[PDB]
Amino acid sequence: MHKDVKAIYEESKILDEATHLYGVQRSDIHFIADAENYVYELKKDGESFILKITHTIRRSPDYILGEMEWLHHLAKGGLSVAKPIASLNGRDIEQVDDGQGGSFLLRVYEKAPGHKVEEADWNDELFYALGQYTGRMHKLTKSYQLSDPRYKRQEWDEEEQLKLRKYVPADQTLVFEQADRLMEKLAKLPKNQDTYGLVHADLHHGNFHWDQGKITTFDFDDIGYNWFMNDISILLYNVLWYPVIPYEDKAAFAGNFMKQFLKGYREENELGDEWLAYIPDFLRLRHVLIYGLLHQAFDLATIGDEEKAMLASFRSDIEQAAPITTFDFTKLSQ
């Protein structure tokens, strides 16, 4: 958690307001995390929920309300998402005055039913089901109507972690040259109702729970406007890093993951085959973003040998415009 919020947060006081606002006893609130939010698991009436707390120093209620609005739209459309749960006062977000001109921002979500995918389920059938689900999600996002500009989420190029010059040492000229060049290419891509919209923008296999065959997604903190094909490419980037079972031929794995995924996806949303040509640039963009995230997160002086080695490798990859995989995704055209 950001030091300025830590300085304000009196946990027991805020959690007592949470019990008044959501009707859950303190003994049924269990601390999970204090990263970008304070996160707790809540139990009530034999059901499980997740409480997240942030503060106006870090996020406006208007911005979080854009998340709430999108999740309600997906749920209404029949997509299984771990959705926000209204407080006793009917609210998706409860504001709790911090007594010094700010507010803590409380929200409660369903806990996704079931469990993470396990080894025996990591196969072509899973990849297909992920594609079916993602295709349904994209199709539903096409009908989402933003209620007012106040609640607008970020565009793809407004992402904080793409602001490399804010976080990366100023002498990494070639890094910035390559990142800028990549961003200027992507900025020429067409954005319309069938290519671009409000998406999750950070999918990993870990965002998906399985409850005997049925998928439910959770953790939607960073949704924003992006290309449909980039939302897919991000999932691929993340599974390339951390697949449930190791692979050895990266190109063959990537091509087969995408083949199976797109067979599902195509049942639920129509996306033009031209987009296949841009997967490798989207993968590159995610690598740039992570480089930014790492510099944002690290005190560079205090990092260990393993962190330094990671950073050096990322830096070389960006500088050389290295392909994240060499599979020709245009072979998967329909």
Three-state DSSP string of the chain: CCHHHHCCCCHHHHHHHHHHHHCCCHHHEEEEEECCCEEEEEEECCEEEEEEEEECCCCCHHHHHHHHHHHHHHHHCCCCECCEECCCCCCCCEEEECCCCCEEEEEEEECCCCECCCHHHCCHHHHHHHHHHHHHHHHHHCCCCCCCHHHCCCCHHHCHHHCHHHHCCCCCHHHHHHHHHHHHHHCCCCCCCCCEEEECCCCCHHHEEEECCEEEECCCCCCEEEEHHHHHHHHHHHHHHCCCCCCCCHHHHHHHHHHHHHHHHCCCCCCCHHHHHHHHHHHHHHHHHHHHHHHHHCCHHHCCHHHHHHHHHHHHHHHCCCCCCCCCHHHHCC
Type of residue numbered 286: R
What's the token pair of residue 11?
């946990």
In whole angstroms, what is the distance from residue 175 CA to residue 191 CA?
27
Cα gap 132→135, rounded to integer Å: 5
**How far is the C-alpha of 92 from the C-alpha of 224, rounded, in Å?**
19
Q: How far apart are the C-alpha atoms of 103 and 58, rounded to whole Å?
A: 10
Indicate the residue among 93, 110, 127 that finishes a domain: 110
Q: Considering its fold, how many domains does the chain have in total? A: 2
- Ramachandran angles phi, psi of 38, nearest 5°: -80, 130
Q: Please tell me whether residues 160 and 294 are part of one structural domain.
A: yes
Check whether residue 145 and residue 256 sit in a common domain.
yes
CA 230 to chain centre: 12
> Which residues contact residue 228 at a Cβ distance below 8 angstroms, ignoring those fewer than 6 apart?
138, 195, 196, 197, 199, 269, 271, 275
Residue 138 in tokens? 């994209």
What is the span of the domain harbouring residue 120? 115-332
Q: In this structure, how many other beta carbons lie within 10 angstroms of the beta carbon of residue 88?
A: 10
Query: Are 131 and 70 within one domain?
Result: no
One domain for residues 66 and 197:
no
Structure tokens at 236: 């691929």
Whether residue 97 is found in the same domain as residue 131: no
In SS3 terms, 161-193 reads as HHCHHHHCCCCCHHHHHHHHHHHHHHCCCCCCC
Query: At a CB cut-off of 8 Å and minimum separation 6, what does 77 contact?
Result: 140, 143
- Verify that 105 and 119 share a domain, yes or no: no
Structure tokens at 296: 């944002």
Tell me: do 148 and 247 sit in the same domain: yes
Name the amino acid, one letter, at 258.
M
Q: What is the CATH number of the domain that holds 248?
A: 3.90.1200.10
Q: Are residues 14 and 123 in the same domain?
A: no
Task: Indicate whether 202 and 302 sit together in one domain.
Answer: yes
Q: Is the dihedral of CA 189, 135, 211, 243 positive or negative?
A: negative
Contact 236, 283 (CB under 8 A): yes
- Both 226 and 271 in one domain: the answer is yes
Of 166, 239, 136, 155, the C-alpha closest to 196 is 155
- Statement to judge: residues 216 and 310 lie in one domain: yes
CATH of the domain at 65: 3.30.200.20
139 lies in the same domain as 240: yes
Last residue of a domain, one of 90, 110, 130: 110
